[PDB]
Design a protein around this nucleic acid. Sequence first.
RNA 1: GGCCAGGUAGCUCAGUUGGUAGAGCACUGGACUGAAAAUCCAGGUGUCGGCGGUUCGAUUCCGCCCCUGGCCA
Length: 439
Amino acid sequence: XXXGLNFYLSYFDDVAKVLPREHYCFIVGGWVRDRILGEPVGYNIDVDFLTTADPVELAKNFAKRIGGHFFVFEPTIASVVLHLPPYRYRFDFSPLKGKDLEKALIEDLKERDFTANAIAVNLDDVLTIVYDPTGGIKDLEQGLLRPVSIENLKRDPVRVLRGFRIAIEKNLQLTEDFYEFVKEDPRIVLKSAVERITHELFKIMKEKTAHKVIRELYEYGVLEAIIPEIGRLREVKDPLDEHTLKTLEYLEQVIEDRAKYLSAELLENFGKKRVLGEFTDVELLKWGALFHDIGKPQTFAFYEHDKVGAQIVREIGERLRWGDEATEFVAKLVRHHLRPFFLREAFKKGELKRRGMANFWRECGDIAPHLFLLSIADAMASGDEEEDIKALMETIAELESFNRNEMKXXXXXXXXXXXXXXXXXXXXXXXXXXXXXXX
RNA sequence: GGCCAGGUAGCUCAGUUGGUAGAGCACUGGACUGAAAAUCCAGGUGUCGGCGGUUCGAUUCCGCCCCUGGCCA
């Protein structure tokens, strides 16, 4: 332990007004962390507490006070979730028990993954003596995220990704012992539950420096052990894997710059699609950039490798428990991923016509901007000539402007609607349709 | 409380733009054989989990709930 507006939160008062006299409560986890790091409070607040009283009644009355929902789940801990559009509050209360309070505190802290997460403070001193037996402060000053002990990483293998994510997110450098431990057994990641790996994988794709972490998870073979399919890109010598990596990185450089490639109506709904509740479609675009060609080593002489791509992606989505909607998204993104290049190649000959455009926007109108961005970043990774790229953005311009404006007996009904739609581009018309269909 | 997948005949499983719910096995009958196994032919009235919406028409499209399981880093 080393030496209120610095560690204040509005709701803390409420907790103290719930928490009984005899029992004591400590604030642990990422709150004290992010605060020490001096990063400002976001729109999503997550606070983990350690209390000596019954966390369930605590959480029930707390939630009753702030008008939050109540939660109990597996030790056995209690949650309170209060969610309105601008902000989200997750409070997780955890039990603490012992004949010696300080001893048990230190004993809990020491079991934690990283010194940056083991720093804790007493509730009373919030409303400035801190508890950091791992000495998290010292590392946080050096700007280094260092695991407490390797045994606690091995305990819950999924933490091995956290160490990457956190270090990228909070922008810190992992220590040597972490990277050494990953070099030892990169396969350990498979021992942890699947949806955790998925969820962490997405939490890494979320940020815009993600290409460096994905390269990292590749280079230690962790991204291989999770998804062996990525390991198979190297079995074909053009380099395919480096290609997918730089395509990813360029997809981030383009996505940040997205306003100046795509139109406004194409940016309108972009980013607005939700999957797994905290993640948008941008991460799906980054995934479909990683898998953009997953099928090339499967089929070569690469004729079918796009559909093969779709099938492999889909298998990865089923396996890793992604959304069926999201995995279908990524799979369709890898399926049509080569479409704008054929449209550009058709445009360079001036052979692109209303048919190709109408097909384009009927077949896939929703993945269009993602498809365009991905095609532009893949063109930038392939190192296309400037003229070729200019032609590409011009093609995109053509399609965009086409959609912009120029786009505004069971069998019998089907052909009736189809021919009515062809005519829109009258009982006598219906009778004539019937005569044309019957004859 | 959040996300995700399953719910279909007695059991267990197909059904990617919507167009009268099938297949295999099991069960029964018959042909065959001294007998049997084997082989061959024949037999689905299923409130597609429930209530609603869009369509001429919903297992599939959309909304709201029940139940089962997985996860909550």
